[PDB]
Amino acid sequence: SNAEVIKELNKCREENSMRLDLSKRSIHILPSSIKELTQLTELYLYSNKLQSLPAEVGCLVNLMTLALSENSLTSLPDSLDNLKKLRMLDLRHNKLREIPSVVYRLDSLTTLYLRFNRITTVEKDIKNLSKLSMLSIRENKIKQLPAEIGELCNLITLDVAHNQLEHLPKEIGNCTQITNLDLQHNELLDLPDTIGNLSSLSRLGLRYNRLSAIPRSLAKCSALEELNLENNNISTLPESLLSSLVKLNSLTLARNCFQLYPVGGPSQFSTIYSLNMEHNRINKIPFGIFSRAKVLSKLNMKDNQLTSLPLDFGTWTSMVELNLATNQLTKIPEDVSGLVSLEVLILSNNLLKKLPHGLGNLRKLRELDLEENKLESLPNEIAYLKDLQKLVLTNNQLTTLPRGIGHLTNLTHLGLGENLLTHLPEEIGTLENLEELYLNDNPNLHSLPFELALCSKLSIMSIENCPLSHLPPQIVAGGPSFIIQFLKMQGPYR
């Protein structure tokens, strides 16, 4: 209420306090009496209901911090001109349709936050704020930046994510101290060649734009720690780019137009831990490209145009997670046995009819996803996958399972739905750790084995669209809990 605000105002002037916190008090109008509190250096008014800041705030000539986020402001009074020491101005989450003209006159500012307003224009007069080291105008409606952005030579962070930019002014290259430049979720058709002038750049946000190419000069930004180009129109990378990014920890080329790996050979991948290339049109992985990729442990090639794997596929000994889903692979080579560090292998939605015996040598394999292939059998050597917890075989052409399936000590999840299974093996009962067993949509599955009752942790079982005609018809009407209870009691394992 007005009273508790006046009390805090009186308390502030009675302590001669240099900070005033009136945040989160549902204030609609701030009393004029605040003008008397001229000793304030910090004023916090965020998360209130302010539709205007009173002109009297201009009397607080010693303010260095004015925090106004999460109000309903549409402007600021010209009296803020008097705030000749203000360093930080927090205006995010208001209702600004422009930067208020007085803000362009607050040349002491080093930090200006304007996230999530409705601003359409950054006027040429932005040049007046040459002390700015942090400028965030993310989540507005800005279509263009003026060339005058280049007179902000002290910028360290510039965040213009979620705007409508089609280009960047070449004068951005005068902002030589920028380490964090976020342009993601704009409409950028290109980047200026001067981007390479930003030699201290370590974070560069470019995902979700309309880019067709990356400037060769980006290779001068050798402090980049990630390069995420997801969702653009890129199909190549410029000469020697990736090998020049000596601190690159990850690379994302997902959702682009690549048909081949970027040119430059194995040296472009010697520093990254992960490589994400999903949703392109890549038709081949070059022989030898990972020969220098000593720390690369995660490779995502999902949704490409692979019809085979390179002859040195088994040399990828440091790979831990490998996603090859939604390609056109018809076989996995025997040399898969070389991938002794592999823990996750996703092969969903390919054209696989059989699996190699070498698959059984994947001793660390924890998750194997073969959903939506054409598999007519499993090799006996799957029995040696003692670390396997999740085996997804949904939607294939399996008729029987190898008896060795019961040797999968650690298996918890077995997806067998949408197959041609005529029966489960009795060895299913040695799967002591099985929890989820999906059998739905197996139209030739007319019985279940007694030894399924031996699976003590079995808590999820689906049998929809399974005839199960050898069991009592009233039991299958009772659902899985009834079927498993029947197998226990009438079975000889109790």
Swiss-Prot record:
It comes from the Eukaryota. Changing R92A: Abolishes SMP complex formation. Changing Y44A: Abolishes SMP complex formation. One of its GO terms (cellular component) is cytoplasm. GO terms for molecular function: protein phosphatase 1 binding; protein phosphatase binding; protein phosphatase regulator activity; volume-sensitive anion channel activity. Core component of the SHOC2-MRAS-PP1c (SMP) holophosphatase complex that regulates activation of the MAPK pathway. Acts as a scaffolding protein in the SMP complex. The SMP complex specifically dephosphorylates the inhibitory phosphorylation at 'Ser-259' of RAF1 kinase, 'Ser-365' of BRAF kinase and 'Ser-214' of ARAF kinase, stimulating their kinase activities. The SMP complex enhances the dephosphorylation activity and substrate specificity of PP1c. It is found in: Cytoplasm; Nucleus. Keywords: Cytoplasm, Disease variant, Leucine-rich repeat, Nucleus, Repeat. Changing E418K: Impairs SMP complex formation. It is linked to Noonan syndrome-like disorder with loose anagen hair 1: A syndrome characterized by Noonan dysmorphic features such as macrocephaly, high forehead, hypertelorism, palpebral ptosis, low-set and posteriorly rotated ears, short and webbed neck, pectus anomalies, in association with pluckable, sparse, thin and slow-growing hair. Changing K95E: Impairs SMP complex formation. Belongs to the SHOC2 family. Its main location: cytoplasm. GO terms for biological process: cellular response to growth hormone stimulus; cyclic-GMP-AMP transmembrane import across plasma membrane; fibroblast growth factor receptor signaling pathway; intracellular signal transduction; negative regulation of neural precursor cell proliferation; negative regulation of neuron differentiation; nerve growth factor signaling pathway; positive regulation of neuron differentiation. Contains a N-terminal RVxF motif that is important for interaction with PP1c. PP1c (all isoforms) binds to the concave side of SHOC2, via LRR 2-5, 8-11, and 13-18. M-Ras/MRAS binds to the concave side of SHOC2, via LRR 1-10, 12 and 14-16. This is Leucine-rich repeat protein SHOC-2. Changing Y46E: Impairs SMP complex formation. Component of the SHOC2-MRAS-PP1c (SMP) complex consisting of SHOC2, GTP-bound M-Ras/MRAS and the catalytic subunit of protein phosphatase 1 (either PPP1CA, PPP1CB or PPP1CC). SHOC2 and PP1c preferably bind M-Ras/MRAS, but they also bind K-Ras/KRAS, N-Ras/NRAS and H-Ras/HRAS; these interactions are GTP-dependent and both SHOC2 and PP1c are required to form a stable complex. Interacts with PP1c in the absence of Ras GTPases. Interacts with M-Ras/MRAS and RAF1. Interacts with ERBIN; disrupts the interaction with RAF1 and Ras, preventing the activation of the Ras signaling pathway. LRR repeats lie at residues 16-37, 39-60, 62-84, 85-106, 108-129, 131-152, 154-175, 177-198, 200-222, 223-244, 247-268, 271-292, 295-315, 318-339, 341-363, 364-385, 387-409, 410-431, 433-455, 457-478.
